[PDB]
């Protein structure tokens, strides 16, 4: 029993972090095969960040403008190119700890684990959801850029995020592993802000199913609702609308619990209107939207308590 925010074992991503130094700037890079990926602003200086031209700044560097080290081993750079907001540094050794992997663009609402790193050295790990406004509530300090986010399926590592910066509200923005930002953000030291966020409905529901799979049913009711009447309520409360596709996704969890999705929504609609009356669900006093339905199936059991 139990239910926690749970990160993926980070042993495989750890064997791929290195330190990348250009000029006076140091950050983290990701060493897969014979390529080290890192944010391109490693070639920036504090003055440059305000209004940088990357193209211009990079033609001004050579291979040996970049220092790459793993452990105490200096890796030699023998090629470089800019991809979107990232730099691809070809080095003279292939990572022998390179795992099976791929690069995915994560969608809003999906989750991943983040291996926070400093100076190519992994400090810690936690799990965060990509928000609807394309930010994540991470915990990062200066020197954390190039830290990465990923899932692991089977033996494969799906890299979906490299950290590039922090917004004024203290949330984080970054790119997939092709350098294309998540959200309307750019790697410049200029006024930039998170858009309004909303609560991930599909997840709140997946989580209410977890409560039941964990055998707690207190927040259910006799009612049902139409999708459309659910949504007038979703909107009032700054929840994403539910769609028929999200209803199909929740069916397996509906099947394991015997609670109809639209029935569950009525549960939720009631929770939204009446509060939780000082009670907890899965030991939270709040409605939790940072667990996907895939997170619930992985963590929960195949058998419901009762």
């Amino acid at each position: 029993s139990g239910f926690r925010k749970m990160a993926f074992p980070s042993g495989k991503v750890e064997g791929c972090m290195v330190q990348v130094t250009c000029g006076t700037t140091t950050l983290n890079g990701l060493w897969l095969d014979d390529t080290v990926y890192c944010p391109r602003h490693v070639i920036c200086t504090a003055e440059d960040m305000l209004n940088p031209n990357y193209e211009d700044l990079l033609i001004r560097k050579s291979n040996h403008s970049f220092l790459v080290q793993a452990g105490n081993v200096q890796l030699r750079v023998i090629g470089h190119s800019m991809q979107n907001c990232l730099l691809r540094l070809k080095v003279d050794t292939s990572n022998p700890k390179t795992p099976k992997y791929k690069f995915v663009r994560i969608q809003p609402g999906q989750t991943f684990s983040v291996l926070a790193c400093y100076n190519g050295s992994p400090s810690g790990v936690y799990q965060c959801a990509m928000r609807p406004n394309h930010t994540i509530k991470g915990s990062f300090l200066n020197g954390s850029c190039g830290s990465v986010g990923f899932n692991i399926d089977y033996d494969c590592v799906s890299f979906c995020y490299m950290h590039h910066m922090e917004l004024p509200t203290g949330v984080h923005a970054g790119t997939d592993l092709e350098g294309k930002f998540y959200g309307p953000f750019v790697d410049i030291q200029t006024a930039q802000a998170a858009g309004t966020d909303t609560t991930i409905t599909l997840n709140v529901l997946a989580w209410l199913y977890a409560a039941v799979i964990n055998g707690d049913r207190w927040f259910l009711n006799r009612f049902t609702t139409t999708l459309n009447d659910f949504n007038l309520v979703a909107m009032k409360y700054n929840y994403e609308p539910l769609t028929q596709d999200h209803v199909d996704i929740l069916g397996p969890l509906s099947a394991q619990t015997g609670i109809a999705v639209l029935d569950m929504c009525a549960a939720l609609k009631e929770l939204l209107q009446n509060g939780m009356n000082g009670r907890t669900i899965l030991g939270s006093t709040i409605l939790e939207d940072e667990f996907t339905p895939f997170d619930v199936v992985r963590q929960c059991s195949g058998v419901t308590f009762q």
Binding site: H41, N142, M165, E166, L167, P168, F185, T190
Partner: peptide, 5 residues
Amino acid sequence: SAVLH
């Protein structure tokens, strides 16, 4: 401003 870590 945004801050690039």
